Design a protein around this nucleic acid. Structure first.
Ligand SMILES: [Mg+2]
Ligand SMILES: [Mg+2]
Ligand SMILES: [Mg+2]
Ligand SMILES: [Mg+2]
Ligand SMILES: [Mg+2]
Ligand SMILES: [Mg+2]
Ligand SMILES: [Mg+2]
Ligand SMILES: [Mg+2]
Ligand SMILES: [Mg+2]
Ligand SMILES: [Mg+2]
Ligand SMILES: [Mg+2]
Ligand SMILES: [Mg+2]
Ligand SMILES: [Mg+2]
Ligand SMILES: [Mg+2]
Ligand SMILES: [Mg+2]
Ligand SMILES: [Mg+2]
Ligand SMILES: [Mg+2]
Ligand SMILES: [Mg+2]
Ligand SMILES: [Mg+2]
Ligand SMILES: [Mg+2]
Ligand SMILES: [Mg+2]
Ligand SMILES: [Mg+2]
Ligand SMILES: [Mg+2]
Ligand SMILES: [Mg+2]
Ligand SMILES: [Mg+2]
Ligand SMILES: [Mg+2]
Ligand SMILES: [Mg+2]
Ligand SMILES: [Mg+2]
Ligand SMILES: [Mg+2]
Ligand SMILES: [Mg+2]
Ligand SMILES: [Mg+2]
Ligand SMILES: [Mg+2]
Ligand SMILES: [Mg+2]
Ligand SMILES: [Mg+2]
Ligand SMILES: [Mg+2]
Ligand SMILES: [Mg+2]
Ligand SMILES: [Mg+2]
Ligand SMILES: [Mg+2]
Ligand SMILES: [Mg+2]
Ligand SMILES: [Mg+2]
Ligand SMILES: [Mg+2]
Ligand SMILES: [Mg+2]
Ligand SMILES: [Mg+2]
Ligand SMILES: [Mg+2]
Ligand SMILES: [Mg+2]
Ligand SMILES: [Mg+2]
Ligand SMILES: [Mg+2]
Ligand SMILES: [Mg+2]
Ligand SMILES: [Mg+2]
Ligand SMILES: [Mg+2]
Ligand SMILES: [Mg+2]
Ligand SMILES: [Mg+2]
Ligand SMILES: [Mg+2]
Ligand SMILES: [Mg+2]
Ligand SMILES: [Mg+2]
Ligand SMILES: [Mg+2]
Ligand SMILES: [Mg+2]
Ligand SMILES: [Mg+2]
Ligand SMILES: [Mg+2]
Ligand SMILES: [Mg+2]
Ligand SMILES: [Mg+2]
Ligand SMILES: [Mg+2]
Ligand SMILES: [Mg+2]
Ligand SMILES: [Mg+2]
Ligand SMILES: [Mg+2]
Ligand SMILES: [Mg+2]
Ligand SMILES: [Mg+2]
Ligand SMILES: [Mg+2]
Ligand SMILES: [Mg+2]
Ligand SMILES: [Mg+2]
Ligand SMILES: [Mg+2]
Ligand SMILES: [Mg+2]
Ligand SMILES: [Mg+2]
Ligand SMILES: [Mg+2]
Ligand SMILES: [Mg+2]
Ligand SMILES: [Mg+2]
Ligand SMILES: [Mg+2]
Ligand SMILES: [Mg+2]
Ligand SMILES: [Mg+2]
Ligand SMILES: [Mg+2]
Ligand SMILES: [Mg+2]
Ligand SMILES: [Mg+2]
Ligand SMILES: [Mg+2]
Ligand SMILES: [Mg+2]
Ligand SMILES: [Mg+2]
Ligand SMILES: [Mg+2]
Ligand SMILES: [Mg+2]
Ligand SMILES: [Mg+2]
Ligand SMILES: [Mg+2]
Ligand SMILES: [Mg+2]
Ligand SMILES: [Mg+2]
Ligand SMILES: [Mg+2]
Ligand SMILES: [Mg+2]
Ligand SMILES: [Mg+2]
Ligand SMILES: [Mg+2]
Ligand SMILES: [Mg+2]
Ligand SMILES: [Mg+2]
Ligand SMILES: [Mg+2]
Ligand SMILES: [Mg+2]
Ligand SMILES: [Mg+2]
Ligand SMILES: [Mg+2]
Ligand SMILES: [Mg+2]
Ligand SMILES: [Mg+2]
Ligand SMILES: [Mg+2]
Ligand SMILES: [Mg+2]
Ligand SMILES: [Mg+2]
Ligand SMILES: [Mg+2]
Ligand SMILES: [Mg+2]
Ligand SMILES: [Mg+2]
Ligand SMILES: [Mg+2]
Ligand SMILES: [Mg+2]
Ligand SMILES: [Mg+2]
Ligand SMILES: [Mg+2]
Ligand SMILES: [Mg+2]
Ligand SMILES: [Mg+2]
Ligand SMILES: [Mg+2]
Ligand SMILES: [Mg+2]
Ligand SMILES: [Mg+2]
Ligand SMILES: [Mg+2]
Ligand SMILES: [Mg+2]
Ligand SMILES: [Mg+2]
Ligand SMILES: [Mg+2]
Ligand SMILES: [Mg+2]
Ligand SMILES: [Mg+2]
Ligand SMILES: [Mg+2]
Ligand SMILES: [Mg+2]
Ligand SMILES: [Mg+2]
Ligand SMILES: [Mg+2]
Ligand SMILES: [Mg+2]
Ligand SMILES: [Mg+2]
Ligand SMILES: [Mg+2]
Ligand SMILES: [Mg+2]
Ligand SMILES: [Mg+2]
Ligand SMILES: [Mg+2]
Ligand SMILES: [Mg+2]
Ligand SMILES: [Mg+2]
Ligand SMILES: [Mg+2]
Ligand SMILES: [Mg+2]
Ligand SMILES: [Mg+2]
Ligand SMILES: [Mg+2]
Ligand SMILES: [Mg+2]
Ligand SMILES: [Mg+2]
Ligand SMILES: [Mg+2]
Ligand SMILES: [Mg+2]
Ligand SMILES: [Mg+2]
Ligand SMILES: [Mg+2]
Ligand SMILES: [Mg+2]
Ligand SMILES: [Mg+2]
Ligand SMILES: [Mg+2]
Ligand SMILES: [Mg+2]
Ligand SMILES: [Mg+2]
Ligand SMILES: [Mg+2]
Ligand SMILES: [Mg+2]
Ligand SMILES: [Mg+2]
Ligand SMILES: [Mg+2]
Ligand SMILES: [Mg+2]
Ligand SMILES: [Mg+2]
Ligand SMILES: [Mg+2]
Ligand SMILES: [Mg+2]
Ligand SMILES: [Mg+2]
Ligand SMILES: [Mg+2]
Ligand SMILES: [Mg+2]
Ligand SMILES: [Mg+2]
Ligand SMILES: [Mg+2]
Ligand SMILES: [Mg+2]
Ligand SMILES: [Mg+2]
Ligand SMILES: [Mg+2]
Ligand SMILES: [Mg+2]
Ligand SMILES: [Mg+2]
Ligand SMILES: [Mg+2]
Ligand SMILES: [Mg+2]
Ligand SMILES: [Mg+2]
Ligand SMILES: [Mg+2]
Ligand SMILES: [Mg+2]
Ligand SMILES: [Mg+2]
Ligand SMILES: [Mg+2]
Ligand SMILES: [Mg+2]
Ligand SMILES: [Mg+2]
Ligand SMILES: [Mg+2]
Ligand SMILES: [Mg+2]
Ligand SMILES: [Mg+2]
Ligand SMILES: [Mg+2]
Ligand SMILES: [Mg+2]
Ligand SMILES: [Mg+2]
Ligand SMILES: [Mg+2]
Ligand SMILES: [Mg+2]
Ligand SMILES: [Mg+2]
Ligand SMILES: [Mg+2]
Ligand SMILES: [Mg+2]
Ligand SMILES: [Mg+2]
Ligand SMILES: [Mg+2]
Ligand SMILES: [Mg+2]
Ligand SMILES: [Mg+2]
Ligand SMILES: [Mg+2]
Ligand SMILES: [Mg+2]
Ligand SMILES: [Mg+2]
Ligand SMILES: [Mg+2]
Ligand SMILES: [Mg+2]
Ligand SMILES: [Mg+2]
Ligand SMILES: [Mg+2]
Ligand SMILES: [Mg+2]
Ligand SMILES: [Mg+2]
Ligand SMILES: [Mg+2]
Ligand SMILES: [Mg+2]
Ligand SMILES: [Mg+2]
Ligand SMILES: [Mg+2]
Ligand SMILES: [Mg+2]
Ligand SMILES: [Mg+2]
Ligand SMILES: [Mg+2]
Ligand SMILES: [Mg+2]
Ligand SMILES: [Mg+2]
Ligand SMILES: [Mg+2]
Ligand SMILES: [Mg+2]
Ligand SMILES: [Mg+2]
Ligand SMILES: [Mg+2]
Ligand SMILES: [Mg+2]
Ligand SMILES: [Mg+2]
Ligand SMILES: [Mg+2]
Ligand SMILES: [Mg+2]
Ligand SMILES: [Mg+2]
Ligand SMILES: [Mg+2]
Ligand SMILES: [Mg+2]
Ligand SMILES: [Mg+2]
Ligand SMILES: [Mg+2]
Ligand SMILES: [Mg+2]
Ligand SMILES: [Mg+2]
Ligand SMILES: [Mg+2]
Ligand SMILES: [Mg+2]
Ligand SMILES: [Mg+2]
Ligand SMILES: [Mg+2]
Ligand SMILES: [Mg+2]
Ligand SMILES: [Mg+2]
Ligand SMILES: [Mg+2]
Ligand SMILES: [Mg+2]
Ligand SMILES: [Mg+2]
Ligand SMILES: [Mg+2]
Ligand SMILES: [Mg+2]
Ligand SMILES: [Mg+2]
Ligand SMILES: [Mg+2]
Ligand SMILES: [Mg+2]
Ligand SMILES: [Mg+2]
Ligand SMILES: [Mg+2]
Ligand SMILES: [Mg+2]
Ligand SMILES: [Mg+2]
Ligand SMILES: [Mg+2]
Ligand SMILES: [Mg+2]
Ligand SMILES: [Mg+2]
Ligand SMILES: [Mg+2]
Lengths: 150, 117
RNA sequence: UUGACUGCGAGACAGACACGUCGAGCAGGUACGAAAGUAGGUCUUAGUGAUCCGGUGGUUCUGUAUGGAAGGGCCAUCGCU
RNA sequence: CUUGUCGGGUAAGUUCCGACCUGCACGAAUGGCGUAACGAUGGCGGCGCUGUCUCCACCCGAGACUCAGUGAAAUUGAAAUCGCUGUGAAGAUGCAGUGUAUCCGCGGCUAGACGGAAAGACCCCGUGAACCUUUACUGUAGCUUUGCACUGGACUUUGA
RNA sequence: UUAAAAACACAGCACUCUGCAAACACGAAAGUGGACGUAUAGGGUGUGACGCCUGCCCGGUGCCGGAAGGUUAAUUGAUGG
RNA sequence: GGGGCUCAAACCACACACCGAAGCUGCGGGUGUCACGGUGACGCGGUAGAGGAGCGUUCUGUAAGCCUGUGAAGGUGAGUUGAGAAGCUUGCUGGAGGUAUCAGAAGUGCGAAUGCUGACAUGAGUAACGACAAUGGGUGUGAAAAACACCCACGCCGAAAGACCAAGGGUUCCUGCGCAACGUUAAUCGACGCAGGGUUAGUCGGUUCCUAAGGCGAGGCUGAAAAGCGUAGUCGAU
RNA sequence: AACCCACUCCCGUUGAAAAGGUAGGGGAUGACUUGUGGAUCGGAGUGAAAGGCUAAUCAAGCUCGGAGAUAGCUGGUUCUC
RNA sequence: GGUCAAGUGAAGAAGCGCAUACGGUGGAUGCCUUGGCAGUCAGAGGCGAUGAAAGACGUGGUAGCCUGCGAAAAGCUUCGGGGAGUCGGCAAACAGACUUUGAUCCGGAGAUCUCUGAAUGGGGGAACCCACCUAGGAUAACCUAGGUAUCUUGUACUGAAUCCAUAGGUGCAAGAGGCGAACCAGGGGAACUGAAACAUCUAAGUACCCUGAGGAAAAGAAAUCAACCGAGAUUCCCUUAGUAGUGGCGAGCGAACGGGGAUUAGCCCUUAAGCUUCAUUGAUUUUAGCGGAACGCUCUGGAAAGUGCGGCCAUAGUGGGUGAUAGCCCCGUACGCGAAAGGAUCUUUGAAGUGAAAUCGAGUAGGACGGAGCACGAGAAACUUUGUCUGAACAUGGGGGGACCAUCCUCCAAGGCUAAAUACUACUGACUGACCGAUAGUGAACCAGUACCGUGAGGGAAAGGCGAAAAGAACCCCGGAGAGGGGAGUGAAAUAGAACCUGAAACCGUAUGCGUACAAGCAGUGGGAGCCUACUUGUUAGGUGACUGCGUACCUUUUGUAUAAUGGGUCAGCGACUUAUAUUCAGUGGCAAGCUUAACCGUAUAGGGUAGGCGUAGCGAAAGCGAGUCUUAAUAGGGCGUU
């Protein structure tokens, strides 16, 4: 904090509490006692602890019927209303779509759709698989989980 | 995440100043003096629940003495006579009869007397 | 006459630690005594100073490319009112 | 030691002046002993003069006091803030016992509130600090000795 | 800005240093003062008008002079291992 | 301890009764440990300190949710619920935001540090109102006059408390209009507020010319660098 | 007398004043007093020498940096069971 | 009913206490934001003698200040954009005007650009004073435009002691000078502190001062390491490893070899890569802009974006603000187009220059003395460097391999140039935040490095919020043609009235109820009469509290405090166990004789990367041997270890 290099008054004789600087943490414009610095919040998770949690999540999604498996899922031309009609057939509104590779057309749609996210097998994290009400996966993506997760 | 103390500090000072209602001078309107007054008031109240039971037995015993000597007996001789015969009536109930039901107190004193005590 | 021996050491006493004290028995070599045996100093309890550093005598150790050497380690010992 | 002893000065003199010598512990350029003039310099004694004093009295102005206007300060845990004799962190408004006492101002005085003011300056402590001294220790500027360099020729004495 | 003095200065006195590019002082140095001076001058030290005077000690510690001998640095490198 | 106490209310023996603690018992609750399968048992004063379990504050996810102008946060009362930190429901005020639950992260909880900043008390309507030259009437103006203006008197300075240069200040100078603040009181007055105006040089003082102490200093000499000294020169009034 | 100074008493000590005032006091042609301009400063300057003075600061100025020096010492340390 | 006596004792408060209700003062809290803080990704990394950074003074229809400009002075000329309002802000009014014949506004290129400042014609107290020369123009007491500092380099002329020619002197050109937060390479270089004292040592070659360069700099192509096998310039990151060493062997300091990565590159002295500056060949960016979809009804309300009902748009759906909460109201957003003219970058091919030291390196390598650097403090002390003094060989030669010798191995010094990976941000743009939200965040949200303080260097504040919209209160009355109020009006609301959101506490008042003038002390609490209020009319709730039993504050520090021991006048706000990196133990998880990656790649929290670390074996000082091993003459004993 700027300033505060000298003693405000002499050590003895004035009848005032001892001071060494006007920029003390006890003073109005003084510094912060344990001021923060930019730091990192980033834990270590074992590669196998990460895979064990994914297996645990996927097993529970099957038990709760929150996983829907379909034979392929593609759309022609990027149009949000084209995808909305397709999802209405399956009766899904808040859904996470997982495919073995994110097509450009399927990514361009669902970009502006409110409660719909289009992810990838390696791009789907533990949080997203729990946050959405349903998970839609294709058989080609189901094979991909088996290879990655054993 | 900077936390401001204004709302919580004010709510805590008002709880103390509400218990200090009716106290004199600064004891009811400044926190530093009212905090000590509330603590000492609670110290006194804890001790005086013990003393309430002592002050009331002493009052019953003094009134039983006054009623027994009107029938020709002292307190210590009446208590020995009551224990000799049968009676387990409290000093609290006995002091009530000595003032309110004087004909019943006389009968008890006369029965305690007949136990030769 | 050299047991004021060399390697140890069951088991203890003391004790914050670092130090301290006693010791049967085994193995080598001895000395006295005919021999059983006794001897790991003195009737006992004081007579003392850590580590570092440097010196001296040994040594199945190490020895900065390799063979040596210097230097280091290990064992014995010297230098503090 | 000591207000040494003797003399003078006073009614009375631990101070003063003159001596004595037993100099605890004077002494000759860190000068010895004298000295006219000089000193807002130290000690003692007189004359004059006096409220310095016995012992204070009266008078005159400026405050203090009252009325109108403006309007501080240090201090402060909270106060319904008496005496005495005990007790007790050992000197009590506040505790015990006891005695006194209607409620509230104003002018005065300072005995107490261990009154206010300044984290005691005396004293001790801190493996505190500054500055000063020296034949404390360890160094250093300066001054000085010698070798080499800048730096040569000749003659002579002389050691190898 | 609690000490005006018996403290400091002083005229006078003495010792000592300095031959001029002076001794001495300020300057890493150039230079500057001393001094546009020159031993009747300049620096340091003590004492402190004037009068009468200033006694004994050179063992200690300084300073000055001496050079025979003893001890003695960098340097050099005989000898031995 | 006091009142008071004498075949005692003293002392020495003996006897019986009673009072007297948060001790013990009774009744109703809460907790710790252990055993058994909710009961039994014995525990539950506490500083330094060790161990266990919680409340509340701000921010992030849950949350593009839910609540909210038919009234959010905040403020101020009342009631009520827990062993506690605390929670909940409502009247009034307020006028636009809040955050259930379970997780995550901390600038996370003040009475003290002769603590820091702001506001306000006590002293107290008390001390003081700044040289003890000195003031008294009349008149005017004005809402208002001890203090302003004028007049009649009285006092004070006069080697100054009168005039004038320099330094320093910078509009304080004059005139209209004003009085909140400033003026240690009031003020119609002012070195105060607003707005206008006001300073005229061949001879006065500077500038220009000259130099002192001293400064700077081409080249130069010196110095790790920055720089020091200095010659020609050119600045510098008192 | 002016002018420079500061010996005594009293007042003042929250002062009219962070060193004054009234009444007395010393020097007053000199080692005098004073205006303007200039030079020397922080282990440095200047000092008729008191450790005095160097901007109300001096047994080593002020300012900003090393720097949040160090403090076996005082003080303080915030919700519940 | 009369007199007397004795007894008893309501009300009457100068003023105080408590409770409640209304105010005042004051500014907390809540909500808010034109201001800050920290990052990521880019940019471009300098400006200046063609006069900088920083300023003084001036400049407008009317006073000041801020912003912009400069005597052509809130502007002049040209291109490019647009498309109807405009004459900047605090900060409003009154005026005068401008214009679809294209204004204001935005971007590129020009013109003008006072005085001071490196300040440069000479001086000077910065914003001032005094000049000279050349060309042109006036006749009076000048005007206009150019020149005139110093040093270095090159060139022309000239010329002292002195013959020659040197020093020197004039004239031309070209360059430099000053400023800037950090980064870089050098010169000089502390102390506090730690070692629980302190000298060696540390702090530390840090702070600080000085000098040069650049957009980066520096270093760089083996007289290098290894170890008899090999590697192959420099720089940066992760390990080896807190190991080997070093050290009053104290406190401490601290490698290399060998591995894993980022980058990829060398070329010359028989004259090269490369780099500059021009001239050309193409491309890409930057300095401004243009288009940009889809909503109605109903209720409450001052006002719908909110309720209820039904639709539509999506490469545009958690943007901003509109009278309360909006994908469809406005500005935007995804996505598409764009440039008269400047800038920059990469790209061809032509020139000029440079690289450049000439020819392979001599006062050099080596040595002696004193220092410095290497992790290494003289130590067995190798290697680099140099203040003083010396001093070789020439490829059958020279350097190194940690004293030294021999043998091997490996390099060729005393001459040069060289990008990338690396460092930093005063400055510009965009985006982001489990950052702040007016005592916080920058000292600075506001006309802040200001006011103020100091001779100076320097130090350094306080101070935000009416309302949706000024609709900012016409008019009446009291008052000094006041201040301030009472009405009336505006507004949803003036107790939102300008010192204006909310409006807490300390502190100061007014009103009502009960208590208080014979009574002794931490002011409370156990008991408790009476009075007042409300309604359920008393086993009730609220307010007071006569009288009475007990009862010497809190914190700190102590063997011990009511202590007459310390601290606090009170209130509100703020104010003290944190963070990073290495570790050990416990709880809780994943894998398991194995576990785990670091830098770094990355389709980026995934996946890869197993270099490394720990474990599966110990004993010994070590060589070494190994379920054993060390000591010893000893398969004896003993220490440590093994199911
Ligand atoms: Mg600053
Ligand atoms: Mg400072
Ligand atoms: Mg203080
Ligand atoms: Mg301080
Ligand atoms: Mg300090
Ligand atoms: Mg502040
Ligand atoms: Mg701050
Ligand atoms: Mg702060
Ligand atoms: Mg990974
Ligand atoms: Mg989506
Ligand atoms: Mg806070
Ligand atoms: Mg009460
Ligand atoms: Mg009792
Ligand atoms: Mg009882
Ligand atoms: Mg023997
Ligand atoms: Mg034996
Ligand atoms: Mg034997
Ligand atoms: Mg025999
Ligand atoms: Mg030692
Ligand atoms: Mg070898
Ligand atoms: Mg050896
Ligand atoms: Mg005497
Ligand atoms: Mg005598
Ligand atoms: Mg006599
Ligand atoms: Mg006398
Ligand atoms: Mg006498
Ligand atoms: Mg005499
Ligand atoms: Mg004598
Ligand atoms: Mg004498
Ligand atoms: Mg003599
Ligand atoms: Mg003497
Ligand atoms: Mg004499
Ligand atoms: Mg005199
Ligand atoms: Mg004198
Ligand atoms: Mg005399
Ligand atoms: Mg006398
Ligand atoms: Mg009198
Ligand atoms: Mg009088
Ligand atoms: Mg009055
Ligand atoms: Mg008065
Ligand atoms: Mg007493
Ligand atoms: Mg007493
Ligand atoms: Mg008393
Ligand atoms: Mg008390
Ligand atoms: Mg008492
Ligand atoms: Mg008591
Ligand atoms: Mg009085
Ligand atoms: Mg008095
Ligand atoms: Mg008194
Ligand atoms: Mg006292
Ligand atoms: Mg006192
Ligand atoms: Mg202190
Ligand atoms: Mg003290
Ligand atoms: Mg000591
Ligand atoms: Mg000690
Ligand atoms: Mg000294
Ligand atoms: Mg010495
Ligand atoms: Mg020497
Ligand atoms: Mg010499
Ligand atoms: Mg004096
Ligand atoms: Mg005098
Ligand atoms: Mg004096
Ligand atoms: Mg003197
Ligand atoms: Mg001299
Ligand atoms: Mg002489
Ligand atoms: Mg002298
Ligand atoms: Mg003398
Ligand atoms: Mg003298
Ligand atoms: Mg003298
Ligand atoms: Mg003398
Ligand atoms: Mg001698
Ligand atoms: Mg002699
Ligand atoms: Mg001699
Ligand atoms: Mg009693
Ligand atoms: Mg009897
Ligand atoms: Mg009994
Ligand atoms: Mg009981
Ligand atoms: Mg009990
Ligand atoms: Mg029970
Ligand atoms: Mg108990
Ligand atoms: Mg307990
Ligand atoms: Mg949240
Ligand atoms: Mg409401
Ligand atoms: Mg909130
Ligand atoms: Mg509310
Ligand atoms: Mg909102
Ligand atoms: Mg939440
Ligand atoms: Mg905070
Ligand atoms: Mg803080
Ligand atoms: Mg904290
Ligand atoms: Mg805190
Ligand atoms: Mg506190
Ligand atoms: Mg507080
Ligand atoms: Mg506390
Ligand atoms: Mg105080
Ligand atoms: Mg403090
Ligand atoms: Mg406080
Ligand atoms: Mg304060
Ligand atoms: Mg008052
Ligand atoms: Mg008074
Ligand atoms: Mg008075
Ligand atoms: Mg008075
Ligand atoms: Mg006065
Ligand atoms: Mg008059
Ligand atoms: Mg008057
Ligand atoms: Mg006169
Ligand atoms: Mg006059
Ligand atoms: Mg005059
Ligand atoms: Mg002037
Ligand atoms: Mg002035
Ligand atoms: Mg005027
Ligand atoms: Mg005037
Ligand atoms: Mg007028
Ligand atoms: Mg008035
Ligand atoms: Mg005033
Ligand atoms: Mg006034
Ligand atoms: Mg006055
Ligand atoms: Mg005026
Ligand atoms: Mg001159
Ligand atoms: Mg000069
Ligand atoms: Mg020069
Ligand atoms: Mg001149
Ligand atoms: Mg003149
Ligand atoms: Mg004087
Ligand atoms: Mg007098
Ligand atoms: Mg006088
Ligand atoms: Mg004179
Ligand atoms: Mg004269
Ligand atoms: Mg003279
Ligand atoms: Mg004189
Ligand atoms: Mg003069
Ligand atoms: Mg001067
Ligand atoms: Mg100077
Ligand atoms: Mg100094
Ligand atoms: Mg000095
Ligand atoms: Mg002196
Ligand atoms: Mg001095
Ligand atoms: Mg002295
Ligand atoms: Mg000053
Ligand atoms: Mg001074
Ligand atoms: Mg010092
Ligand atoms: Mg440091
Ligand atoms: Mg400092
Ligand atoms: Mg400190
Ligand atoms: Mg300390
Ligand atoms: Mg201690
Ligand atoms: Mg203390
Ligand atoms: Mg403290
Ligand atoms: Mg009252
Ligand atoms: Mg009242
Ligand atoms: Mg009241
Ligand atoms: Mg760049
Ligand atoms: Mg440039
Ligand atoms: Mg101007
Ligand atoms: Mg201007
Ligand atoms: Mg203008
Ligand atoms: Mg301007
Ligand atoms: Mg022009
Ligand atoms: Mg156009
Ligand atoms: Mg110029
Ligand atoms: Mg010039
Ligand atoms: Mg030029
Ligand atoms: Mg000029
Ligand atoms: Mg020439
Ligand atoms: Mg430059
Ligand atoms: Mg820079
Ligand atoms: Mg350097
Ligand atoms: Mg450097
Ligand atoms: Mg160096
Ligand atoms: Mg040191
Ligand atoms: Mg130390
Ligand atoms: Mg220490
Ligand atoms: Mg020390
Ligand atoms: Mg040391
Ligand atoms: Mg030393
Ligand atoms: Mg060092
Ligand atoms: Mg350096
Ligand atoms: Mg540069
Ligand atoms: Mg370069
Ligand atoms: Mg540059
Ligand atoms: Mg450049
Ligand atoms: Mg680069
Ligand atoms: Mg380079
Ligand atoms: Mg290079
Ligand atoms: Mg090979
Ligand atoms: Mg290479
Ligand atoms: Mg050591
Ligand atoms: Mg390495
Ligand atoms: Mg390597
Ligand atoms: Mg553009
Ligand atoms: Mg558009
Ligand atoms: Mg649109
Ligand atoms: Mg667009
Ligand atoms: Mg929005
Ligand atoms: Mg609203
Ligand atoms: Mg919107
Ligand atoms: Mg609409
Ligand atoms: Mg070569
Ligand atoms: Mg060499
Ligand atoms: Mg050497
Ligand atoms: Mg060395
Ligand atoms: Mg050593
Ligand atoms: Mg070698
Ligand atoms: Mg050499
Ligand atoms: Mg070599
Ligand atoms: Mg070779
Ligand atoms: Mg070797
Ligand atoms: Mg090496
Ligand atoms: Mg080369
Ligand atoms: Mg770097
Ligand atoms: Mg960047
Ligand atoms: Mg606020
Ligand atoms: Mg602020
Ligand atoms: Mg501030
Ligand atoms: Mg000033
Ligand atoms: Mg000033
Ligand atoms: Mg209305
Ligand atoms: Mg309101
Ligand atoms: Mg309002
Ligand atoms: Mg609002
Ligand atoms: Mg308000
Ligand atoms: Mg209030
Ligand atoms: Mg009242
Ligand atoms: Mg009464
Ligand atoms: Mg009475
Ligand atoms: Mg009383
Ligand atoms: Mg009760
Ligand atoms: Mg009641
Ligand atoms: Mg009561
Ligand atoms: Mg009571
Ligand atoms: Mg009591
Ligand atoms: Mg009592
Ligand atoms: Mg305390
Ligand atoms: Mg004590
Ligand atoms: Mg004590
Ligand atoms: Mg004791
Ligand atoms: Mg006690
Ligand atoms: Mg107390
Ligand atoms: Mg007291
Ligand atoms: Mg005390
Ligand atoms: Mg006390
Ligand atoms: Mg104490
Ligand atoms: Mg106090
Ligand atoms: Mg704060
Ligand atoms: Mg564990
Ligand atoms: Mg595990
Ligand atoms: Mg074994
Ligand atoms: Mg074993």
């Amino acid at each position: 904090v700027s300033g505060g290099g000298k003693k405000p008054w002499r050590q003895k004789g004035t009848g005032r509490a001892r001071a060494g600087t006007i920029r003390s943490p006890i003073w109005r414009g003084g510094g912060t006692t344990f001021a923060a610095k930019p730091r990192s919040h980033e834990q270590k998770l074992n590669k196998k602890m990460y895979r064990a949690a994914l297996r645990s999540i996927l097993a529970e999604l099957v038990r709760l019927d929150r996983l829907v498996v379909v034979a392929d899922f593609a759309v022609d031309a990027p149009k949000t209303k084209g995808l909305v009609a397709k999802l209405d057939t399956l009766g899904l509104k808040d859904v996470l779509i997982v495919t073995d590779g994110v097509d450009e057309n399927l990514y361009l749609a669902a970009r502006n759709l409110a409660h719909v996210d289009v992810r990838d097998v390696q791009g789907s994290d533990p949080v997203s698989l729990i946050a959405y009400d349903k998970v839609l996966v294709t058989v080609s993506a189901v094979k991909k989980f088996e290879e990655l997760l054993g | 995440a900077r936390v401001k103390r204004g709302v919580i500090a004010r709510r805590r000072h008002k709880k103390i100043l509400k218990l200090a209602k009716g106290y004199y001078g600064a004891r009811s309107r400044v926190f530093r003096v009212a905090k000590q007054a509330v603590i000492k008031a609670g110290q006194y109240a804890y001790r005086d629940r013990r003393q309430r039971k002592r002050q009331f037995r002493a009052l019953w015993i003094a009134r039983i003495n006054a009623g027994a000597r009107q029938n020709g007996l002292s307190y210590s001789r009446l208590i020995a006579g009551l224990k000799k015969a049968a009676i387990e009536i409290d000093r609290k109930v006995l002091a009530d009869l000595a003032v309110n039901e004087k004909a019943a107190f006389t009968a008890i004193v006369e029965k305690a007397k007949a136990s030769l005590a």
